Design a protein around this ligand. Structure first.
Ligand SMILES: Nc1ncnc2c1ncn2[C@@H]1O[C@H](CSCC[C@H](N)C(=O)O)[C@@H](O)[C@H]1O
Ligand SMILES: O=c1ccn(O)c2ccccc12
Ligand code: NA
Ligand code: NA
Ligand code: NA
Length: 215
């Protein structure tokens, strides 16, 4: 019912498959299209490869994660790179304040399914409160067709639309790939999940890419 210990352990190295050392490809694709604007919030940032990429491009970025190990790793990576633009804080995405009207772009790179269904309303009210007028919002989340009921709260397209449309104006929801480097034999033989083998030793699982804004 709570993943806090699991995420803390995965970041402490007791490396996470989703820590691919680059922003998620579906989200990098939006960055090159010029969709990321002004001050950015990387919500449930983890090791924050997307925050680092945006800070290198000139954005002032803030990454929030419930995991103190994730925050420390994100801060350690920004310091190795000599980034002054990127900051990180330990926070619960479902219930945080102190950033009223701050951000022009809010990105959720796989945080969405990493919290309980019941926490979604608190999370959506928190990020809207943290949004500047006319802010953009991007979500990359697992598809319920690929990830079953259990520790991960993956969504159907209709479920994602219903949840987010209450708070933001949705521009697009389209199928997407979530990339990771899984260990050999991950999820068994035969495999209990549909894991696609990708070029450059990567794997991917089915998901959704949502694009929204305030207007
Ligand atoms: N309630 C919550 N508040 C903030 N972060 C949370 C959270 N629940 C889960 N998380 C974080 O959500 C992340 C999901 S994993 C994805 C991490 C990163 N965005 C990436 O793309 O690599 C983890 O870092 C986890 O600690
Ligand atoms: O194994 C995973 C557990 C949680 N998250 O969010 C992921 C994201 C992308 C790829 C893999 C994972
Ligand atoms: Na969580
Ligand atoms: Na669950
Ligand atoms: Na696509």
């Amino acid at each position: 019912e709570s993943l806090d210990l699991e995420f803390e352990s995965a970041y402490r190295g007791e490396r996470p498959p989703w820590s691919i050392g680059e922003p998620q490809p579906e989200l990098a694709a939006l960055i090159v299209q010029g969709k990321f604007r002004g001050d950015v919030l990387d919500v449930g940032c983890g090791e924050a490869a997307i925050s680092l990429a945006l800070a290198e491009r000139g954005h002032t970025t803030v990454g929030l994660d419930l995991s103190p190990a994730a925050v420390e790793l994100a801060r350690h990576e920004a310091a190795k790179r000599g980034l002054a633009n990127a900051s990180f804080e330990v926070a619960d995405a479902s219930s945080f304040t102190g950033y009223d009207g701050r951000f022009d772009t809010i990105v959720d790179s796989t945080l969405f399914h990493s919290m309980p269904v019941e926490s979604r309303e608190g999370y959506l009210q928190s990020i809207v409160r943290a949004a500047a007028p006319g802010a953009s919002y991007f979500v990359l989340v697992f598809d319920r067709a690929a990830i079953p009921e259990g520790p991960i709260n993956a969504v159907t397209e209709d479920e994602l639309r219903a949840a987010v449309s209450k708070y933001w104006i949705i521009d697009e929801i389209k199928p997407a790939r979530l990339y990771a480097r899984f260990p050999a034999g991950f999820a068994g033989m035969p495999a209990l999940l549909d894991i696609r083998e990708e070029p450059n030793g990567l794997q991917s699982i089915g998901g959704w890419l949502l694009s929204a804004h305030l207007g």
